[PDB]
């Protein structure tokens, strides 16, 4: 009660700011959960996180410790074992009454913390039967046996909790988290091998070590419980990895049928793990694969029409100088974003260089921020004539990179670079072009067509009337 | 004839309601099949289903029982065998005359049950030659041998029936049916191993057990027919799983060539099964993989233009708060649906909150149900200015979730939440905005633009005339 | 010269009609090739086909026969061998002068047969150097050795010819041709195993059988050339399939390094074959996989908005009753076809039922064949109100299947089926609907909207003027 | 200083012309780097390339030589070893001061060479800590040990340099570079096997060869360092390839745990390499796979509507005569190109045949070069009526290939081929067509619709006014 209540709120500094955005919303959420019910626990809290971590580190320890103690220890020595059982049972029993006061995430953004009445109404018909049935520690003797067998369904519980924490933590991978995921799956396969090896030692022990089993043939009848277990894990690992039998082929019928069961189960589990890990690795470089497919389609197109190899080389260069080996499309990406995001990106890219035009300075910021929505991004190669003489002028350009040489008859050479705006005369009248610019380097330009500018100027009458004046 | 005729109709309570929709159509279909022909059987019936199940459980039993009796039983004891043969032959013969009176599914919705004349006209040139040829029980002696060999083509028959029932049952998978499909394929591979093991015992038996074969080397010459068969299945399973030879490498030429045939066939069959099962598992989470690819393309786009890490973090959050880790698109989905479905979904999402606007109450339901077709669904983040001062008003918003704080100069703070409609003034006149709202939580809004509302109001003149008045 | 000239033309009855379309074009092509040059051979002929088949069946026989005769026959007995060599050499030499008079397929439709001058101009700088260099049968002695080694580059020649015939034969697979392709690749892998096994017998023979090799350990020193070769193929097959060593692990350094080379090469070749065969099998059911992905996206969409389970069940049924478990899109398919194809398909689907409208009979066929371009195909479920009272009429419908019950106040029930056109009154005036039809079965309808009909009637003034009158 | 300064510039004749385009830009870039800083080195130079190649060929030699000298040489004979160490250390130390004067590629096109101040500002917080820490040659003794261990992090350095050179060299694959990539990955896996085999000899050597290890069992205790190493590589290769244990199963606990570690690591590494190589091979024929999927969707569409087999055969032919077995789309490809590229391709395809029209000769080149943007490419089959009598004329055609027979009532037969323009009369007036042409071969036509021509003629008033006159 001293420091305990403060751990009930969503206090994660890094996790909750990522999930809620603003600290005012985080403080507000804590106040709402505190003021709402009798005394409730939030599922974005530090306390729920450490409690779930303790439950996972208990269940993994049970899954390791149980099948070694079933078959390997000749002397039961129940005392320490029964103490271990009771601690796990009281942890599940403390948890059973804890999972009735926690908010349930109906949606990722906001969850409901109204009262335990709603929470129990979902929790009952959601999982209460299997959780309570596994949670408790000749009909009565049969129930004792059934209760022992039923408590095995707890495993499923960890699966739900892992999946909840994993998804709310990390859902779009990078290289490092993919490596962590692969190491987790290799640990799970090793756990399956551990259970399998204990079973393959257990079954010849229940028949009291006949002469056909592998324990009697290998002279490992009486030896240290570490050596027997290690050899059993080896045999189960070799059946999984399909590198062979442990030492000799099965010679008794119990060993033959156990080996066939272990072979089928282990080989199917391994070769279905590795396909998942291969898809997990190959899902990192998806953009480069999309670029290669697009280039293959372009290559087929050039082969269909029999272009000369000069044109094909130019097309190959142009693509390598635009997508840069990775495929994307700004159009759909800027159409999927909301309005302040698409405002900020367009503003950051083009605001500084578009404010340098002296016709753009004194205008209202609404006018220029509506003009910012019509800029097209283009790439020109060395030697391409952007403008040619006698052509009707239709769009203007702003340099974003590169150098551009202007060719005039009188003035024999003129250079522009570092973001230079040209072809500006086409915005105020219609007629033939008077010069011709040529790219000298791979120049990225931002284009503004006259049709789009005309529509914007029509939309703001005061701007258009000022232009008339 | 007592209860028999009622089983001829499509009486499945769960299956036929799924297939036909309305019970009036189910009763009508049964009446039509009953009244149409002489005496016909429907292929959506209970009777056809149990008959096909009995045929499958007979053919699987034949496929298991035949190659054990060919090679393993030293004493033929034909009597019980010949009785078993005759029961299978009369089942195929009862079936041969049954498959002339069943409706044929030309299409999934409705099938034709007009007369046996049409059914025989398809059935003859469709499968009657192979079905009748397998269906019957020195030229005459050669025919006896050919008839024995030909009856083997019946296997194909089960393939057609399984495929028909499987497809008309379940065609879009979940996790559980995928697990059932994988267990079925493992059973088929085990069947192939069973045939292979019986063959590998049969071929050294026909040469009367020479000293080079594996039966004579392993001292399994005279032993129980269970031990020999089990070891043979083991050897065939080890050749399939490629974990090694059964015990020692082949030492005779018959064993060498049999082992090479079994190796090639088994390894190709296994490694072509496992690729199918991997694709079957990976086809469950397709939406999450589509989301990861879209995010990778977005990441490449942010790297191409060198945005600051603040903007990149906002873009990462915005996507995690919109698609929720799974990729979809409402546009094409609502364009692929028919008219009452797309009516019902739009009505359920927006009808309750759009009826709260006091301008929407007294209007005709045609007007509001045509207004319901222009609502766009948007997501705004904490801190994003939805409206800013001095901006021309162009769309209104209805809260579907979250809180929104209105900022006014005089009234220092105003809150809206639980589905609150604001920016309503822009529908009735054009001019600068007078306040500025700011999101406080991740708010889902439904937007209605003035252009769409203007088009609707033009379409209903009486509504527009009422607005004028 | 008697029957010989007639085999020079493209005489394939099945292949050339598939490739050229019309028999007049086939006769014309033969006349053009006959009349064009001195005396030329067409590469769509029967003669070129049988000649290429003979060349392939010679080169495969050489690839099998050579490495058995290099290492297995103790007595060279050159005589028959040298005769075999000379027949293969004169076949390549007859072919060298034959590949100067055959037309070259610059494009699949029409090839050039103008003169040998153009053909030699491509053939020289295309492949003449490697073909002629492999085609011929101390510097002179070194050349004899180099000529022996160079003639090995002929293998490549078969690769070009196989690829040409395979592609011009079959390029879009079915199940059977996929099975043929897989059997071909298994034959190629068996060929590689054959060469590998002969090498693994050759290398311990060149050292004159030391005590560490597998031939001396297994006591196969002097034995029949069939037994040695069979065991060598077995060892190479076990190294490829990775099922183990042939019998014992390598004990000499020559065997160790040979086994490591054979292991790496064989395992990489096998596991790169099987991925190709898995992709080849999985490329048959692509439409069903596209349907499953679309359904998964739809399921995510229904989960995002929390619809009741009634609506979700209706959406699940509607999709299963429209795409029928396989995904396609008529739009892009009918936009990719040329004009007589898209004319024929639309005409076959809708001409018979659209001619039954008595307003459509007496009109010009241009008018109705332009009306045929505006029909939309829809599917309605049991219980969906197609029309409701008081709604403004906007489109008419033609039944293509199913029954539809019309509900009127006076006339209590009216049925339509077998292709019945209703809602026809909306084409001639605007106003509220007067009845309401309801689907009783899963009915496929063809819809015609008033906007499209109005545009067509405007396009034909005489039709529109007749309607006015 | 004599020839040394000239190697500092981007002097690659083949690489730098590919990267910069024009030789004037290459000369200009060299002048800019020379004139800019104190004395700097460009990362597109010959010198940087040879220096990085020398560094890679040193680090690979270190990775091979180190773990043979750790465990295999009984006599240390430090002298030559310590000399080898010092040469590698002084190479890393010469490099440490060299990587402070090289330009850093912020973008692929142009990099910054302004001053070492910016370069050090990126290089410090980018990699200077790990590079300098690995670059140098009881706390002091512990540091000596830590320095030995830390210098192992240099490996990473080669990974960055390889990735930079690989990407700036080759990014879209062909067959040959894919084969080179696969051979590189097999070399990397062999390197891992080399380290693994040295470890499996090292661990039984540190325990001074007990009787359970494989070295003592196989009698390889004292033998040549080539035989021991070769057998160790064999055992590591067999654990990777999962073909079995080297000779006998592990019999001591050290061997058992080493074999389990080596099994898991090697099998996971191999089966994750082979999936990458399979995806790398299958990414070459992507266009043919896209064509097969499109054809499967078309086949489903023909099966949904029950067309006769004549129509299906025509659809199958038409597709095989248009995409030619490989899938592409000109639309998006010509929409992704910049303006001079899309000018050049359209001009090369259609300029020569469109200039033959005598109405197109005397016009201004702007008019025809704007007409060139409206040509649609179509394919017609034998027997398809392109025009039929009594139909309103709407588009004209230019032959690009094939023969076309014109049918007239008076003139009984008229042929056109070799690029013949017909239907020209529809451009100057509206009315019924007067003849009907029929394709005789698979003819590729270029179509020009009247609507597009009318829009162009409206755009150029002088052309339209001339047509009026």
Swiss-Prot record, chains A, B, C, D:
Q: Which residues lie within the membrane without crossing it?
A: 213-241
Example GO molecular function: potassium channel activity
The record's tissue-specificity note reads: Highly expressed in the heart sinoatrial node (SAN). Not detected in atrium, ventricle, forebrain or cerebellum. Detected at very low levels in total brain.
The record's GO CC annotations read: axon; dendrite; HCN channel complex; plasma membrane
Stretches assigned to the Cytoplasmic side: 102-114, 174-176
Chief location: membrane
Question: Where is this protein localized, as stated in its record?
Answer: Cell membrane
Q: Which residues bind 3',5'-cyclic GMP?
A: 323, 326, 328, 330
Q: Post-translation: what modifications? A: S-palmitoylated.
One GO process term, biological-process aspect: regulation of membrane depolarization
Task: Give me the segments passing through the membrane.
Answer: 45-73, 78-101, 115-137, 138-173, 177-207, 252-284
Domain remarks in the entry? Contains six transmembrane segments (S1-S6) and an intervening P-loop. The segment S4 is the voltage-sensor and is characterized by a series of positively charged amino acids at every third position, while the S5-S6 segments together with the P-loop form a centrally located pore of the channel. Contains a cyclic nucleotide-binding domain (CNBD) in their C-terminal region. The CNBD is connected to the pore forming transmembrane segment via the C-linker.
User: Partners and quaternary state?
Assistant: Homotetramer. The channel is composed of a homo- or heterotetrameric complex of pore-forming subunits. Interacts with PEX5L with a 4:4 HCN4:PEX5L stoichiometry; reduces the effects of cAMP on the voltage-dependence and rate of activation. Interacts with IRAG1; regulates HCN4 channel activity. Interacts with IRAG2; regulates HCN4 channel activity.
What job does this protein perform?
Hyperpolarization-activated ion channel that are permeable to Na(+) and K(+) ions with very slow activation and inactivation. Exhibits higher selectivity for K(+) over Na(+) ions. Contributes to the native pacemaker currents in heart (If) that regulate the rhythm of heart beat. Contributes to the native pacemaker currents in neurons (Ih). May mediate responses to sour stimuli.
Family label: Belongs to the potassium channel HCN family.
* Name recorded for this polypeptide: Potassium/sodium hyperpolarization-activated cyclic nucleotide-gated channel 4
What taxonomic lineage is listed for the species of origin?
Answer: Eukaryota, Metazoa, Chordata, Craniata, Vertebrata
Gene field = HCN4
């Amino acid at each position: 009660q001293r420091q305990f209540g403060a751990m009930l709120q969503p206090g994660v500094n890094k996790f909750s700011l990522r999930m809620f955005g603003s600290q005012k919303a985080v403080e507000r959420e804590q106040e709402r959960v505190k003021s709402a019910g009798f005394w409730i626990i939030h599922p974005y809290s530090d306390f729920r996180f450490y409690w779930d971590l303790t439950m996972l580190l208990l269940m993994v320890g049970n899954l390791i410790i149980i099948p070694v103690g079933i078959t390997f220890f000749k002397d039961e020595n129940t005392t320490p074992w029964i103490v271990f059982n009771v601690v796990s049972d009281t942890f599940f029993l403390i948890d059973l009454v804890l999972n009735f006061r926690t908010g349930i995430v109906v949606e990722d953004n906001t969850d409901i913390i109204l009262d335990p009445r709603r929470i129990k109404m979902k929790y009952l018909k959601s999982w209460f039967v299997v959780d309570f049935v596994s949670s408790i520690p000749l009909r009565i003797v049969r129930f004792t046996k059934i209760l022992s067998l039923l408590r095995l369904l707890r495993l499923s519980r960890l699966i739900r909790y892992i999946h909840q924490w994993e998804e709310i933590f990390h859902m779009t991978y990078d290289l490092a988290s993919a490596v962590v995921r692969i190491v987790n799956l290799i640990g799970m396969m090793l756990l399956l091998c551990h259970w399998d090896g204990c079973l393959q030692f257990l079954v010849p022990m229940l028949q009291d070590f006949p002469d056909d089993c592998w324990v009697s043939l290998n002279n490992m009848v009486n030896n240290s419980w570490g050596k027997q277990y290690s050899y059993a894990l080896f045999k189960a690992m070799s059946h999984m990895l399909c590198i062979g039998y442990g030492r000799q082929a099965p010679m008794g019928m119990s060993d033959v049928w156990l080996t066939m069961l272990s072979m089928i189960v282990g080989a199917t589990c391994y070769a279905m793990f590795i396909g998942h890990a291969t898809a997990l690795i190959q899902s990192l470089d998806s953009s480069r694969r999309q670029y290669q497919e697009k280039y293959k389609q372009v290559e087929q197109y050039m082969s269909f029409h029999k272009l000369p190899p000069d044109t094909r080389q130019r097309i190959h260069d142009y693509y390598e100088h635009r997508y840069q080996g990775k495929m994307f499309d700004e159009e759909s990406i800027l159409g999927e974003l909301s309005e302040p995001l698409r405002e900020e990106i367009i503003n950051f890219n083009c605001r500084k260089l578009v404010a340098s035009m002296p016709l753009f300075a004194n205008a209202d910021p609404n006018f220029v921020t509506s003009m910012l929505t019509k800029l097209r991004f283009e790439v020109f190669q060395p030697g391409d004539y952007i403008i040619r003489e006698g052509t009707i002028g239709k769009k203007m350009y702003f340099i974003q990179h590169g150098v551009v040489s202007v060719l005039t008859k009188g003035n024999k050479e003129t250079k522009l670079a570092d973001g230079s705006y040209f072809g500006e005369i086409c915005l105020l009248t219609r007629g033939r072009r008077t010069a011709s610019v040529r790219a000298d380097t791979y120049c990225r330009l931002y284009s503004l067509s006259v049709d789009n500018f005309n529509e914007v100027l029509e939309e703001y009458p005061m701007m258009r009337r000022a232009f008339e004046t």
